[PDB]
């Protein structure tokens, strides 16, 4: 029933508190330098005049060392996906009971800081699995093909929006977090205007 | 009057930069139906921000119930909108208004909308709401300091509830807690305090505030034994007696009993339930058009389980309940269940037999596993009184022979419904699948296959269902070698098809 798949990774998770999309994943430098090795070898044999031994040495040398050429090749490999936002990948949770424990995201940005070893996930997708920042390691698989990425569309962050209990009700995984709600509470529910008696007098 | 008027779709067709550039005023809002409201700009900005799926469909009518302040209705007399209370902004309220905006477009056209497009528009609207409320709202940040504690602590109604209080359960839970619960619910006392405004907004819980601003009452031991003398102080003014703090230290001792046998047995329960529930699959939209309508009694406790269900009323064709009927509380209503309808698929059902829950399920989704999943998440949340006994009771009912073998499944459904819904919130459309998964036609001829008319209703054991049907699914359960050395498995009978059948043979098409 399958075990120990290839083109995979396993790392701890952080959040993205930014203006972004609901399906965006940020792979760090050390994970992205080893998960995309033959892609970097193809880009270094195509754009530059290098053999596969020199390309393998350039890939394995700059894992714990930042340089501009590998970052530019990562930006090119992200930009090569024409109908998608990036490379399609799947993301799992180790207790997998519900629908939200297995999702499909897109790699959109490789980090520049070498000390940060964590995959940064969206805020709205934190609720569908029981995933917190309590030192837990989460798994990731890389879909190679376009047909496989189209077939993995059945598990998506938009698939668990509708509830499986009530007939016409959106489930509670769409609810915002604490500090996201509290600013709107302090903004909207404030003594901002005089009441309706004083306003028309 | 000095109140500007805005239309419904005029604020929706406005730009994102011009939406926040609105003057601070009370204003009239017209809607597509024959009603109009009055509102503040800071509420209709959030209302337009939650109206994102209505922007793609510029022809559907927008009712007056989509606004957060739908209680305010402009009438000819000013007594209905002068001093009234609107709606409280809640994390669930925006999701409910997005759900209303989705089902408004769903019932705009007649029953032909792809629900996955609306489900993607919901998360797109939530993402746009987050990206607009994060950037544009940066000056209004909630805070917490010593002053926020001293503002609520120095209230006289809170300080009166902590002095001259007898150490009694009635004197604490009813007398002492009531005098502070009646002032926490007052909307004209704490205006501007972040703790009370977060309590009224559903973020902070009131059960954790009575143990801090009022008397903490009766912590327990490892066993369920209460103590005679309770702790006098709370959490703001801390506990500093040795006896009271030693009782309080035993309250956190029960939060560490997390042995691995519980996490093993809930995974064993999920593996036992889903492997037998995975037989029924691939529901189809439409109508099978049968007059073999079953009949079930509806009570008060299981009325939420009959929310999305089609029944047969007098002088009518079909109707769904949706859960607002105070009547039909003691009668026996004729329903339309999966037991006894005729579809050409040998393992599928229709949309009208399953109910209104099927449109919330995507097209390429197994309806068999999600019933056991919807049971198991509530069971695990009840696990995380004696929920393991409830889990073993559901195992003995569903996957054993502890039920009396009835002649027809129409009397087996309400017993399982009143056993499940009294403690676990579960819809009856999942219980119908969990009962139908144990149904076998022609048990005297060993024809281990699901019957399409459910009027037969012949039930057997769980292990005989696991071994004598679909050996590729039998290789996934425990005791794999017992279906191998069986003489009944070496003859070509017409049987069902498990999804695991492709992983057993490697992935061959035939
Ligand atoms: Zn049917």
Lookup: tokens for B302? 């299981």
Going by C-alpha positions, the residue among B215, B208, B204, B209 that lies closest to residue B174 is: B215
Distance CA A133, CA B138 (A): 25
Residues of B in contact with A19 (CB under 8 A): 131, 134-135
Residue A118 three-state SS: coil
What residue in A sits closest to B500 (Cα-Cα)? A1
Q: How far apart, in whole angstroms, are the C-alpha atoms of residue B239 and residue B54?
A: 55
> Where do runs of H (alpha helix) occur along B136-259?
146-153, 156-160, 169, 177-184, 194-200, 242-249
Give dist(CA A42, CA A39) in Å, integer. Answer: 5
B53, two tokens:
């799926």
CA distance B440 to chain A (A): 27
Which helix (H) or strand (E) segment is A43 a member of?
Answer: helix A38-47
Order of strands, sheet of A13-15, starting from the edge strand that comes earlier in the sequence = A8-11, A138-142, A87-92, A102-110, A25-27, A119-121, A13-15
Q: Report residue A109: phi and psi, to 5°.
A: -155, 130
Q: Smallest CA–CA separation between B443 and chain A, in Å?
A: 32
Burial class (CB in 10 A: 0-12, 13-18, 19+), B321: buried
Residues after which chain B is discontinuous, using a C–N cutoff of 2.5 Å? 384
Residue linked to tokens 């279906």: B483
Residue A149: both structure tokens together: 């990425």
Bridge partners (DSSP) listed for residue B27:
B39
Distance A89 CA to ligand 1 centre (A): 38
- 3 state SS of A102: strand
How far, in Å, from the CA of B431 to the mean position of ligand 1? 16
User: Which residue on chain B is closest to A182 by alpha carbon?
Assistant: B142
Give the angle B245-B249-B252 at the CA atoms, nearest 5°: 150
Given a contact cutoff of 8 angstroms between Cβ atoms, the answer to whether B90 and B105 are in contact is no
Q: Which residues pair with B318 in a beta bridge?
A: none
Q: Report the C-alpha gap between B283 and B436 in whole angstroms.
A: 14
Closest residue to A188, CB basis, from B89, B126, B380: B89
Query: What's the CA gap between B456 and B410, in Å, rounded?
Result: 11
**How far is it, in rounded angstroms, from Cα B160 to Cα B208?**
19
Distance from the alpha carbon of residue A143 to the mean position of ligand 1, in angstroms:
38
Considering only CB atoms, which chain B residues are within 8 Å of A199?
2, 26
B453 CB neighbour count, 10 Å cutoff: 14
Contact B220, B250 (CB under 8 A): yes
Reduce the DSSP state of residue A197 to 3 states and report it. Answer: helix
Cβ–Cβ gap A178/B115 under 8 Å: no
| Under 8 Å between Cβ of B399 and B273 | yes
Decide: B411 and B296 in contact? Cβ < 8 Å.
no
Give the three-state DSSP class for A104.
strand
Query: Looking at chain B, which residue has its C-alpha nearest residue A199?
Result: B26
Which residues in chain B have their CB less than 8 angstroms from residue A175's CB?
A: 91-92, 95
Give the SS3 label for residue B348: coil
Residues in chain B closer than 8 A to A178 (CB atoms)? 203
Dist. CA B467–CA A97, nearest whole Å: 25
Rg (C-alpha) for chain A, rounded Å, is: 21
| Distance from the first to the final alpha carbon of chain A | 75
Question: Residue B467 and residue B474: Cα distance in Å, rounded?
Answer: 6
Structure tokens at B310: 């089609």
Per the CB < 8 A criterion, the answer to whether B357 and B259 are in contact is: no
Question: What is the distance between the alpha carbons of residues B417 and A130, in angstroms, rounded to a whole number?
Answer: 28
User: What is the DSSP annotation of B258-326?
Assistant: --HHHHHHHHHHHHHHHHHHTTS---BSS--------EEE--STTTTTTSS-EE--TT-S-EE-TT--S
**B430 C-alpha vs ligand 1 centroid, how far in Å?**
15
d(CA B269, CA B159): 50
Residue B333: strand pairing partners:
B296
Nearest C-alpha in B relative to A165: B427
Cβ-Cβ contacts under 8 Å for B268 (sequence gap 6 or more): none
In sequence order, which residues have a C-beta less than 8 Å from that of residue A169 and are 6 or more positions away? Answer: A163, B99
Positive or negative torsion for Cα B295, B301, B302, B306: positive
Q: How far apart are CA B510 and CA B500, in angstroms?
A: 14
Q: Using a CB cutoff of 8 Å and minimum separation of 24, what contacts does B373-377 make?
A: B373/A97, B373/A98, B373/A99, B373/A164, B373/B274, B374/A164, B374/A165, B374/B426, B374/B427, B374/B430, B375/B273, B375/B420, B375/B424, B375/B426, B375/B430, B375/B434, B376/A97, B376/B266, B376/B269, B376/B270, B376/B273, B376/B274, B377/A97, B377/A98
In Å, what resolution does this model reach?
3.3
Run of H or E residues at B472 = helix B471-474
d(CA B169, CA B217): 8
Give B-chain residues touching A158 at CB under 8 angstroms: 116, 119-120, 122-123
Residue A173 carries which DSSP code? G
Neighbours of ion ligand 1 (CB under 5 A): B 288, 341, 350, 353
A chain contacts of residue B503, beta-carbon cutoff 8 Å: 1-2
Cβ <8 Å between A158 and B120: yes
The CA distances from residue B261 to A24, B125, B393, in Å, are 37, 42, 18
Per residue, the 3-state secondary structure of B66-104, as one string, reads HCCCCCCCCCCCHHHCCCCCCCCCCHHHHHHHHHHHHHH
Does A201 contact B at CB distance below 8 Å? no
Residues of chain A positioned with their CB less than 8 A from the CB of B420: none
For A125, name the nearest residue in chain B, comparing CA atoms only: B123
Chain B closest CA to A68's CA: distance in Å?
Answer: 31
Any B CB within 8 A of A186 CB: yes
With CB atoms and an 8 Å threshold, state whether B26 touches A199. yes
DSSP A144-169: -SHHHHHHGGGS-TTTTSB-SSSSS-
Structure tokens at B344: 């050409």
Asked if B374 and A164 come within 8 Å (Cβ–Cβ), the reply is yes
Residue A135: exposed, middle, or buried by beta-carbon count in 10 A (0-12, 13-18, 19+)?
exposed
Contact criterion met (CB below 8 Å) for B53 and B128: no
Neighbouring C-beta atoms of residue B307, cutoff 10 Å: 22
Of A17, A172, A189, the CB nearest to B89: A189
Return the beta strands (E) in chain A as ranges. 8-11, 13-15, 25-27, 87-92, 102-110, 119-121, 138-142
> Residue B434 and residue B308: Cα distance in Å, rounded?
17
Please calculate the CA angle A84-A87-A91 and round it to the nearest 5 degrees: 115
**CB-based contacts of B219-226 (< 8 A; 24+ apart in sequence):** B219/B247, B219/B248, B219/B250, B219/B251, B220/B250, B220/B251, B220/B254, B221/B250, B222/B250, B222/B253, B222/B254
Q: What is the CA radius of gyration of chain B?
A: 29
Output the CA–CA distances (angstroms, integers) from residue B262 to A164, B252, B380, B386, B388, in the order listed.
26, 19, 10, 12, 8
């Amino acid at each position: 029933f399958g075990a120990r798949l290839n083109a995979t990774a396993r790392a701890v998770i952080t959040s993205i508190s930014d203006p972004h999309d609901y399906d965006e994943l940020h792979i760090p430098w050390g994970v992205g330098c080893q998960l995309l090795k033959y892609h970097l070898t193809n880009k270094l044999k195509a754009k530059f005049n290098m053999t596969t031994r020199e390309a393998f040495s350039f890939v394995y040398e700059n894992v714990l060392q930042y340089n501009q050429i590998i970052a530019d090749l990562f930006k090119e490999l992200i930009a090569e996906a024409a109908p998608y936002k990036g490379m399609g990948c799947t993301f799992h949770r180790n207790p997998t009971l519900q629908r939200g424990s297995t999702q499909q995201f897109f790699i959109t940005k490789v980090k520049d800081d070498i000390n940060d070893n964590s995959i940064s996930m969206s805020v709205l997708c934190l609720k569908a699995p029981n995933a917190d920042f309590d030192g837990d390691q989460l798994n990731l698989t890389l879909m190679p093909d376009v047909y496989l990425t189209k077939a993995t569309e059945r598990i998506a962050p938009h698939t668990w929006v509708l509830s499986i209990d009530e007939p016409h009700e959106i489930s509670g995984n769409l609810e915002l977090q604490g500090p996201v709600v509290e600013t709107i509470i302090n903004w909207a529910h404030e003594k901002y205007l005089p009441p309706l008696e004083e306003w028309l007098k | 009057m000095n109140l500007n008027r805005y239309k419904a779709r005029d604020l929706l067709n406005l730009s994102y930069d011009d939406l926040w550039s609105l003057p601070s005023e009370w204003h009239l809002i017209e809607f597509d139906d024959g009603k109009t409201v009055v509102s503040v700009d800071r509420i209709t900005k959030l209302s337009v921000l939650c109206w994102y799926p209505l922007k793609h469909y510029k022809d559907c009518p927008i009712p007056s119930d989509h606004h957060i302040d739908f209680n305010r209705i402009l009438t000819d007399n000013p007594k209905d909108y002068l001093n009234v209370e609107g709606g409280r902004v809640t994390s669930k309220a925006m999701v409910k208004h997005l759900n209303k905006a989705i089902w408004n477009i769903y019932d705009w056209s007649g029953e032909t909308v792809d629900p996955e497009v609306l489900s993607k528009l919901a998360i797109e609207g939530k993402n746009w709401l987050y990206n607009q409320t994060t950037v544009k709202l940066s000056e209004y940040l909630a805070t917490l300091s010593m002053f926020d504690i001293a503002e609520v602590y120095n209230h006289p109604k809170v300080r009166e509830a902590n002095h001259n209080i007898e150490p009694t359960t009635y004197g604490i839970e009813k007398i002492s807690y009531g005098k502070v619960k009646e002032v926490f619910n007052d909307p004209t006392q704490f205006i501007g305090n972040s703790i009370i405004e977060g309590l009224r907004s559903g973020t902070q819980k009131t059960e954790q505030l009575l143990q801090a601003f009022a008397w903490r009452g009766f912590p327990t031991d490892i066993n369920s034994d209460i103590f005679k003398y309770p702790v006098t102080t709370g959490y703001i003014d801390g506990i500093w007696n040795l006896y009271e703090n030693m009782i309080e230290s035993r309250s956190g001792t029960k939060a560490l009993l997390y042995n691995k046998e519980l996490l093993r047995v809930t995974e064993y329960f999920n593996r036992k339930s889903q492997l037998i529930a995975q037989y029924v699959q691939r529901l189809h939209p439409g109508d099978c058009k049968t007059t073999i309508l079953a009949e079930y009694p509806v009570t008060k406790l299981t009325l939420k389980a009959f929310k999305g269900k089609y029944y047969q009323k007098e002088d009518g064709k079909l109707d769904w309940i949706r859960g607002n009927e105070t009547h039909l509380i003691g009668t026996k209503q004729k329903f339309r269940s999966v037991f006894g309808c005729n579809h050409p698929d040998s393992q599928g059902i229709c949309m009208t037999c399953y109910g209104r829950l099927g449109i919330n399920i995507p097209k390429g989704t197994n309806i068999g596993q999600v019933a056991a999943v919807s049971m198991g998440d509530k069971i695990t949340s009840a696990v995380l009184a004696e929920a393991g006994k409830l889990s073993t009771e559901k195992v003995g009912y569903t996957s054993k022979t502890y039920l009396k073998n009835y002649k027809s499944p129409i009397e087996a459904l309400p017993v399982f419904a009143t056993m499940a819904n009294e403690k676990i919130s579960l819809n009856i459309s999942h219980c119908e699948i969990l009962i139908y998964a144990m149904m076998i036609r022609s048990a005297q001829y060993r024809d281990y296959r699901l019957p399409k008319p459910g009027i037969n209703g012949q039930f057997e054991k769980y292990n005989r269902l696991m071994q004598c049907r679909s050996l590729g699914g039998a290789m996934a359960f425990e005791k794999q070698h017992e279906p191998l050395n069986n003489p009944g498995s070496f003859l070509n009978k017409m049987r069902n098809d498990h999804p695991y059948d492709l992983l057993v043979k490697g992935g061959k098409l035939r």
